[PDB]
Amino acid sequence: RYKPDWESLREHTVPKWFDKAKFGIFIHWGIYSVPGWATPDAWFFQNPYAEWYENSLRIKESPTWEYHVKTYGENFEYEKFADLFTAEKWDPQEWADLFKKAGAKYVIPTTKHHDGFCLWGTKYTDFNSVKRGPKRDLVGDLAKAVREAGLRFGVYYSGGLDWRFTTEPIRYPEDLSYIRPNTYEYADYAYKQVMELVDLYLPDVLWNDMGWPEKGKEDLKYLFAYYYNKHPEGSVNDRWGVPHWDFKTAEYHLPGYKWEFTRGIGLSFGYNRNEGPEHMLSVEQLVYTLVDVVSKGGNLLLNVGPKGDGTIPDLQKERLLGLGEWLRKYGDAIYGTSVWERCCAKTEDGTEIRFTRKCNRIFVIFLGIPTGEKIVIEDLNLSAGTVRHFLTGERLSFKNVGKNLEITVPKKLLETDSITLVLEAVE
Amino acid sequence: RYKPDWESLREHTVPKWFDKAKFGIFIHWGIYSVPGWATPDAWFFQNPYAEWYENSLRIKESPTWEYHVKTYGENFEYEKFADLFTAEKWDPQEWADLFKKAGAKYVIPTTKHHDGFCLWGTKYTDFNSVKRGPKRDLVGDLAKAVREAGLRFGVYYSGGLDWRFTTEPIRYPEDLSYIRPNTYEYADYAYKQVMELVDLYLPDVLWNDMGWPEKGKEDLKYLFAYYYNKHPEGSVNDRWGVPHWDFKTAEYHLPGYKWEFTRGIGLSFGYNRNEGPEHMLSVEQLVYTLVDVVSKGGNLLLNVGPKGDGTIPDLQKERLLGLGEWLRKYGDAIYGTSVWERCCAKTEDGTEIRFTRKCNRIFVIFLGIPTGEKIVIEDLNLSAGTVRHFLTGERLSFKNVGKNLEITVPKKLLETDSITLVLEAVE
Amino acid sequence: RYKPDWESLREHTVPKWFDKAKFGIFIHWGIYSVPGWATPDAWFFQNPYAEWYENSLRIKESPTWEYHVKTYGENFEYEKFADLFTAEKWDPQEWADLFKKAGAKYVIPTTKHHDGFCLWGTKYTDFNSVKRGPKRDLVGDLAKAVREAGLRFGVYYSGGLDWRFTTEPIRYPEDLSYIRPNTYEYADYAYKQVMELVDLYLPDVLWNDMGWPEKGKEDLKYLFAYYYNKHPEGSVNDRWGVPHWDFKTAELPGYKWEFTRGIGLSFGYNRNEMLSVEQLVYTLVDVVSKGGNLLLNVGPKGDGTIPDLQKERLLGLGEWLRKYGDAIYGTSVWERCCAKTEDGTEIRFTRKCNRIFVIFLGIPTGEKIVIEDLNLSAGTVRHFLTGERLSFKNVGKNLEITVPKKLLETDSITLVLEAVE
Amino acid sequence: RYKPDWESLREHTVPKWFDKAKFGIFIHWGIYSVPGWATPDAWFFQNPYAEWYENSLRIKESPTWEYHVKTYGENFEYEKFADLFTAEKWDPQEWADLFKKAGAKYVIPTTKHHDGFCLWGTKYTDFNSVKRGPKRDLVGDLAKAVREAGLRFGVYYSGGLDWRFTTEPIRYPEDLSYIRPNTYEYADYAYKQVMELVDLYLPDVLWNDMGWPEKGKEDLKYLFAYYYNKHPEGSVNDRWGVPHWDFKTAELPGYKWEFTRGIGLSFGYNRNEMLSVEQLVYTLVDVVSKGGNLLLNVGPKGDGTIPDLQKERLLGLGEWLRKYGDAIYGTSVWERCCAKTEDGTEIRFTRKCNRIFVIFLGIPTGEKIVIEDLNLSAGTVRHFLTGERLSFKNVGKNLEITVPKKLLETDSITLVLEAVE
Numbered sequence A, B: 001r002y003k004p005d006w007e008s009l010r011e012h013t014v015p016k017w018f019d020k021a022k023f024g025i026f027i028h029w030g031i032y033s034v035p036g037w038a039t040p041d042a043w044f045f046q047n048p049y050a051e052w053y054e055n056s057l058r059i060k061e062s063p064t065w066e067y068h069v070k071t072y073g074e075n076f077e078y079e080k081f082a083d084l085f086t087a088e089k090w091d092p093q094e095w096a097d098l099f100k101k102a103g104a105k106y107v108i109p110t111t112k113h114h115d116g117f118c119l120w121g122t123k124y125t126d127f128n129s130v131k132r133g134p135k136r137d138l139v140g141d142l143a144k145a146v147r148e149a150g151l152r153f154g155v156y157y158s159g160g161l162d163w164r165f166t167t168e169p170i171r172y173p174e175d176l177s178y179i180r181p182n183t184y185e186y187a188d189y190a191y192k193q194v195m196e197l198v199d200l201y202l203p204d205v206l207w208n209d210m211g212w213p214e215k216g217k218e219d220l221k222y223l224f225a226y227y228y229n230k231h232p233e234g235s236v237n238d239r240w241g242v243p244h245w246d247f248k249t250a251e252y253h254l255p256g257y258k259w260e261f262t263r264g265i266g267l268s269f270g271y272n273r274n275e276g277p278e279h280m281l282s283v284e285q286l287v288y289t290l291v292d293v294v295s296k297g298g299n300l301l302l303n304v305g306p307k308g309d310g311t312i313p314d315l316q317k318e319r320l321l322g323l324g325e326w327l328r329k330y331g332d333a334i335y336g337t338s339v340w341e342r343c344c345a346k347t348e349d350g351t352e353i354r355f356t357r358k359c360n361r362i363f364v365i366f367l368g369i370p371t372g373e374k375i376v377i378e379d380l381n382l383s384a385g386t387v388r389h390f391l392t393g394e395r396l397s398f399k400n401v402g403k404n405l406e407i408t409v410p411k412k413l414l415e416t417d418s419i420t421l422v423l424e425a426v427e
Numbered sequence C, D: 001r002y003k004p005d006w007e008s009l010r011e012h013t014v015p016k017w018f019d020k021a022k023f024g025i026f027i028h029w030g031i032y033s034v035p036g037w038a039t040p041d042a043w044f045f046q047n048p049y050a051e052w053y054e055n056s057l058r059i060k061e062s063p064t065w066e067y068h069v070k071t072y073g074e075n076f077e078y079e080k081f082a083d084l085f086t087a088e089k090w091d092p093q094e095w096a097d098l099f100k101k102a103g104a105k106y107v108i109p110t111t112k113h114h115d116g117f118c119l120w121g122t123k124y125t126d127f128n129s130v131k132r133g134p135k136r137d138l139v140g141d142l143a144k145a146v147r148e149a150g151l152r153f154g155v156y157y158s159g160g161l162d163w164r165f166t167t168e169p170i171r172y173p174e175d176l177s178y179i180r181p182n183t184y185e186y187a188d189y190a191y192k193q194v195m196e197l198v199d200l201y202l203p204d205v206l207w208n209d210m211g212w213p214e215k216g217k218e219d220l221k222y223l224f225a226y227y228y229n230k231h232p233e234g235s236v237n238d239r240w241g242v243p244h245w246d247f248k249t250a251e252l253p254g255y256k257w258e259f260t261r262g263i264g265l266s267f268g269y270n271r272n273e274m275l276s277v278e279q280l281v282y283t284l285v286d287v288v289s290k291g292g293n294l295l296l297n298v299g300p301k302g303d304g305t306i307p308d309l310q311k312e313r314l315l316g317l318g319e320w321l322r323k324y325g326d327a328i329y330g331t332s333v334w335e336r337c338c339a340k341t342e343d344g345t346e347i348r349f350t351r352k353c354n355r356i357f358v359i360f361l362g363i364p365t366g367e368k369i370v371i372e373d374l375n376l377s378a379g380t381v382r383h384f385l386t387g388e389r390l391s392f393k394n395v396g397k398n399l400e401i402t403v404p405k406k407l408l409e410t411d412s413i414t415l416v417l418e419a420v421e
């Protein structure tokens, strides 16, 4: 039983389901999705994250302001996007089904992003999807659908930033230090809202962003204790600005700790019209990224930015479904695995290789499919055992040659693989 | 003049009236009195304190939950008891008169217990007796009546616990560390409410329970300074979780400091139907307890748990009135006394003895009436003086025999006493 | 048992012996006693406290600097007075006995004053009376003598100020906010020294001066708990800078406190310098009537003798106390401290159970006495010394009492009456 | 690289070797070993821990005070035991080898226990084993021997308690809240000594006891970062009083922890005083099944020999561990620790990938075994030693297994089964 102090909360280790899940879907959706626009040390003047629309708009003359004055006019307050956000083509079951086939094991929507708009029927502000726009509990309906599809549900909350409590935009990164809600009122609000999400939706992940208000950091002792005692399988990210977390997050990419890399299929998290497939990962690069991350002990949290009407952009769909097809073939070498002696190796040709492990098995995942039958892996040796082609299970001849390892794979099997050659060695 | 720091507030010593009062009446009354039910390390699963009804009810399947689903049904929220709490047979003057005859010198009702329901017309919540239930300022009406009877009035406030601000029950004692209001809002609320009680009712005791919110502990510097500067005769208990108090409290029973033992006539504080006179102190044991406590420097705060309709249970009445009859006879040996060289002694027969002191006089109070004329007190010697039978004032022969003291008391006088033989020695 | 937190240490109320004591003796004695000299918002430039000699000397061209540069020389360091401090005629038994006769109930010597010189054989500095000067544990020998005479023994310690750790003089009051040892080393040193006084001598009073080093204030919850648990009748003044004290100090309250002053002005002996016996009595009575103890300072000489003038006044106090002590010892405050007669004579009150002692600061010259703005419901007023019942009457707002001249002439210094109620 | 803040130090998870080790040896050895005596809410008055000898001795008239005033004399100071502590028959290689044979994977000696005596050549006190007694770096020579035998080496340090800094004995538990060194000087000393252990010996475990001085707790974020950066496979217990630990200690959790106890009751050697080999095995298994390591204490004699009784039991453990070690080393917890047969025999579980080891605390006498309130979906259950497949069946809430008597008779102390799923 967890007590509200850091020493006791350290007893809560990362839950097993999270280490085994490997792949989760982030969803950045809100009233910013309605305009759904961003540009192609002044990152905040030329912000490619469309979720940040309100911030960009508050910086007058920026590319986001100039786009806004054309489309909606100068007297359109950012706040009015909430009435246009009717999510009328939204089918939460379709989303859930899409995420399942993508091969995702958990799903995490933005319940409240930096703009302060809440995607549930919170008692603590009318600025929410039940009283405005969709007239719908979006978070609850999505949780229901996610779990009907057999998946786990978590919640994102923008604890550290809420532009309902500020009027001034972030122009440079140092503006983050002081352009914050700052009040005791806000500290209470954020604590009350995350408590509300815990009690209403029992999420398996609490995914905070942008730190936590200084005045509320001691409250997290109590929130984490409460959450873990009610829901021990629950897990917490590392963006709270306090000594406790269950896993770490990265956005720019062997650790003995659990972590999670998150990016969008493109550059933005929120839907961005102005993006296009030249800034987007191919199915191939998405598979390589997932494989690299997993070989290094991480989970991939891949983001989807839906349109204001509740449809997921065609490109995004295609990439998720292609990722899912790869995972349907090669999932055994990803789900439920642990890191091996090292993440990485390479062939003589220059093909990168990644290792995962399930018990005695070490999966050898090639980021690419070699052209010839003679594959030579550098700096690697294997004791006596059996090496097999993963997809067909076909036995393979292998030998140790100096410090390298020569494996011989029939062309017939190579032509069978998709994106990655995968082998499998039982020592 | 008191300043808001601990060093200065230490100048406020326990007021004289409190050391001299000896006997006070606690009143545990609220919407929990309406169901008025509790059971005969899992103390919170089988809670015999009926005031804790809401907590017990929130623990589903507990004896309190199962009782509730029969009597009121499953869709009866705890909060609905507030509308049934009409206190329609309440006569505050009868209560006050009863407390006077019981021999009490101060009276302290629960103004707000753990359930958060307020027995006065507070401006800071509608969850109170003026807007709901009785449609009456219960605290003000009772203070008025208590003081018309010549008694002192104090207030109990549940500062540390308020289940209006939590939804989750306390299952084990460690749940107390984190299942608390926790907010800055709550710290303000509690400070504002006790300030309100001070200004409205000018209580001679501030009786806090369950500690004080961590975020509000520095406020108590200001509250105590304010209270003492406005009302210097005022006094404060030791349940605030800060370095200052006027007296200490005990619930499980020679100190150089002032303290106060509190218990119910039975086991529960709030009315409990399910109790009955086998868990209740007799008049005899109530007198012995009072005498023991007073000989050790304490006051007894004896609790009464009224029914929802505002009547005090017959048993409770009988015991108070019997206590009062004893105090009408033997009050001189209790009221206004100080502790002697030691609290205690015993006879050859095994009868416990207790000492109190008024100036040069040392009262010798026997917890029982010995059968024979020759009483022998162990380990006690008296210099030359006069020993008298207390009730009749009759002179008595006494002598020092070794380390013991032989006193000879006529049977005629012994038959005169009630419950306790009391003697009286002027050295 | 006490725990090292303030909420627990509050259970330690002022011990009853201290409440009842009423009168104690301070002793300001050290190497500053050797020169024993002070002057006849520039208080530190012209300091009349002889104990502050080192500070005054560090202020160039001050009256003390001038005296020192004539009598001892400019290159005579103050610390060398330690070699001249021999205490050749010191008899702690004489001291103990004089204090007993004066009516005192406790005795408190300076174990270490601001100059940092220690009057016991401490292990944390060589700048002490065992290694230097007298070659004697002055604190230990006085404690034994004081206790053998039946008096309580306490200790003064200059925790907040130690001029072995600072070079710069205090010139103005604000200088006290920063010219302090300031180091962690000093915080440990002070803690270790008071613990040593506790372990060695188990004093009945811990009398700190000038605050406690900021870095060491959290040590005090442990020190107090340790002290109280070894010695529950011990007591602590209020010059430590923390939530807990047993009595306040000053140089009707509900709380216990203590007024301190010298028989003259300087605490340490001053040759270049006094309350009459009358004035000492009036002061005692005044202080007691307001809930206080008087802590009266004697400043002995380097050779350990208390000057005749001081010896004589303590004895005069003691004779008054032999006569009227029942109106002083073991008393508590009445509903007020003070009153006045129609002819301007001050009155003070004390209480013992049912008796109320009425102590006139003077002996009125007339039989008919009118006390202003007082009534009594007691039913007898008596002359205290004989208990003889007197005729009195509440007349409007005043109280009229007839004391026969024969009874007035029996009193010494103070007319004392006594209402039995 | 780790930074000196708690949020960063949390990246240092419990090292995998410690998770897999399961069994370590504590060694309580010092000058208290010389007298080596303890008694047969007054726990400190009648202390059975021989290591606490100095504390017990400081309590006048206690059983230890009496023994000391007969055997050594009243004026024999405890610190003089340092001269009698010569460790003449000490062979760290013998120690290293016995521990290896016992199946232990790490070894942790007391470098400094509560008495403040240091078993290495520390530069911050002369009260150590190089300047006194053995004239030898005991910590350094044991570390070399332990590592040469292929075992991990850690260090115990009594940070929270050091009786060279306190005079007053612990008499009741609450005394631990204030009878502590308490000074800044001690905070530096402890920090400097643990840094010295890190610099000199790079231990694999830092095993603090009795908390860390309050004034030094902020030093620990720097010490841990420094330690981890020099030695990433290092580890830290949970008796420092700060947010960061690698494992908890005790004398199904998701976290790593460690149970510690002696082969007998006293940690330090006690002449005036034991688990059978069976009991040690059951304890190991019990602890491991709940996610723990067992840290088993030996208390050697002043001459450096471990008594026969202790040598024999460690070896008995080691033989059991040679047989059944695959069910212990490198395992993780299953979905629960424990179960019981219908006839009252306790069961414990461990896990290695797909295999689930079923370890009976006893050898059941019958072929037909019924485990209460358990089912398995695994599809084969085997006798562990041979891997022989057994007949089993889920029957309602229970699990029925037939073990042929021939297979029961092959096991030593524990019947072990094994579900491959």
Ligand SMILES: C[C@@H]1O[C@H](O)[C@@H](F)[C@H](O)[C@@H]1O
Binding pocket: C049, C051, C052, C209, C210, C260, C267
């Ligand atoms: C009693 C008196 O206290 C003051 O604070 C000191 F400055 C002075 O020297 C003397 O010790």
Ligand SMILES: C[C@@H]1O[C@H](O)[C@@H](F)[C@H](O)[C@@H]1O
Binding pocket: D049, D051, D052, D209, D210, D260, D267
């Ligand atoms: C391992 C054990 O730990 C306790 O905390 C100590 F008090 C004891 O002496 C021994 O060292």
Ligand SMILES: *[C@H]1O[C@@H](C)[C@@H](O)[C@@H](O)[C@@H]1F
Binding pocket: A049, A051, A052, A209, A210, A262, A269
């Ligand atoms: C914090 O981090 C990520 C997850 C995005 O939500 C970004 O917009 C926010 F600033």
Ligand SMILES: *[C@H]1O[C@@H](C)[C@@H](O)[C@@H](O)[C@@H]1F
Binding pocket: B049, B051, B052, B209, B210, B262, B269
């Ligand atoms: C605190 O203490 C006593 C006075 C009762 O009110 C109890 O119910 C509460 F928990």
